[PDB]
Design a protein around this motif. Structure first.
Motif, short mmCIF file in Angstrom:
data_model
loop_
_atom_site.label_atom_id
_atom_site.label_comp_id
_atom_site.label_asym_id
_atom_site.label_seq_id
_atom_site.Cartn_x
_atom_site.Cartn_y
_atom_site.Cartn_z
N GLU A 197 -0.42 6.98 -7.09
CA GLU A 197 0.57 7.16 -6.02
C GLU A 197 1.46 8.37 -6.26
O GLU A 197 1.91 9.01 -5.30
CB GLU A 197 1.41 5.89 -5.87
N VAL A 236 0.46 3.76 0.52
CA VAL A 236 -0.15 5.04 0.21
C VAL A 236 -1.53 5.13 0.85
O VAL A 236 -1.90 6.16 1.43
CB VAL A 236 -0.20 5.26 -1.31
N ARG A 265 7.02 12.31 -2.13
CA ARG A 265 6.89 10.93 -1.67
C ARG A 265 7.90 10.62 -0.58
O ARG A 265 7.57 10.00 0.44
CB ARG A 265 7.06 9.96 -2.84
#
Ligand SMILES: Nc1ncnc2c1ncn2[C@@H]1O[C@H](COP(=O)(O)O)[C@@H](OP(=O)(O)O)[C@H]1O
Ligand code: NA
Length: 258
Positions: free
Chosen positions: A119, A231, A126
């Motif tokens: 991730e 994700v 992010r």
């Protein structure tokens, strides 16, 4: 005598390239190299005399083959292969781009365990959902991007795209197409395969060069790590527009988006 491969499995990495090669090796008219030559990408300087020397010997009517998954994404591969011969048949074993990125990451995780999570490597930011397009795992999955470059040197008729998912659920059906694409008589069939509960994939009753049942090595069939479905959703959303384009270029919907 030794001949230059009239058909190459040029990609993709983790789509099921070894499985397909190993299955094609059953046919009496297919001779193939064992290990990935990596000629057109890492060892092109050594010339076609070196390349031809790796190839197995073949009688007339027999087809010589190899598989190197990096060809499909290596920049100079299309021009060089066409330079070997404009008639080379090309096969791409494709897979769900997201599962492929995870399988790619899982392969690295089996070598360097200390790497960051999937991730964190997924994103450049992010907080904003900006995906790292420079990460090789992401970029290999954009099949339409690389396909456009191959179509500058080959007619799409000389290119066959094999379902990696269907290769696992119905190897005999998929390999029916591949044999038609290579002008090989339909010989590989359902009787050649069997399912091993403890492996999780089809296996060969008799591999080429063996009379015993043969599954794929420990390097094939890896347990993927658990990944944040947010994700995955953000990754399926990134590929969606690229997957749709790919379907149109190939005329086939591989079921990754429904
Ligand atoms: N019969 C089979 N046995 C094992 N793996 C198979 C298989 N048929 C297809 N595969 C798939 O082939 C992938 C490897 O592709 P490649 O040889 O091009 O590197 C494996 O990735 P996974 O380990 O993520 O399951 C696996 O999913
Ligand atoms: Na990797």
């Amino acid at each position: 005598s030794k001949q230059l491969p009239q058909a190459i499995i040029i990609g993709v990495k983790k789509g099921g390239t070894r499985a397909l090669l190993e299955f094609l090796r059953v046919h009496p008219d297919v001779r193939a190299v064992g290990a990935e030559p990596h000629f057109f990408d890492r060892s092109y300087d050594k010339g076609l005399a070196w390349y031809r020397d790796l190839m197995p010997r073949t009688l007339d009517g027999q087809i010589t083959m190899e598989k190197t998954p990096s060809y499909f994404v290596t920049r100079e591969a299309p021009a060089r292969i066409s330079a070997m011969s404009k008639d080379t048949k090309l096969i791409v074993v494709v897979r769900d781009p997201v599962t492929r990125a995870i399988s790619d990451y899982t392969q690295t995780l089996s070598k360097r365990p200390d790497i960051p999570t999937f991730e964190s490597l997924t994103f450049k930011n992010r907080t904003a959902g900006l995906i790292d397009t420079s990460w090789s795992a992401i970029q290999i999955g954009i099949y339409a991007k690389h396909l456009e470059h191959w179509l500058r040197h080959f007619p799409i008729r000389q290119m066959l795209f094999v379902s990696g998912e269907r290769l696992i659920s119905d190897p005999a059906g998929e390999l029916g197409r591949v044999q038609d694409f290579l002008g090989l008589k339909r010989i590989i069939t359902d009787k050649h395969f069997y399912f091993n509960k403890t492996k999780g994939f089809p296996c060969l009753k008799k591999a080429e060069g063996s009379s015993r049942p043969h599954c794929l090595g420990k390097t094939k069939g890896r347990t993927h790590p658990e990944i944040d479905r947010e994700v995955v959703r953000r990754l399926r959303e990134f590929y969606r527009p690229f997957n749709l384009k790919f379907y149109q270029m190939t005329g086939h919907d591989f079921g990754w988006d429904g």
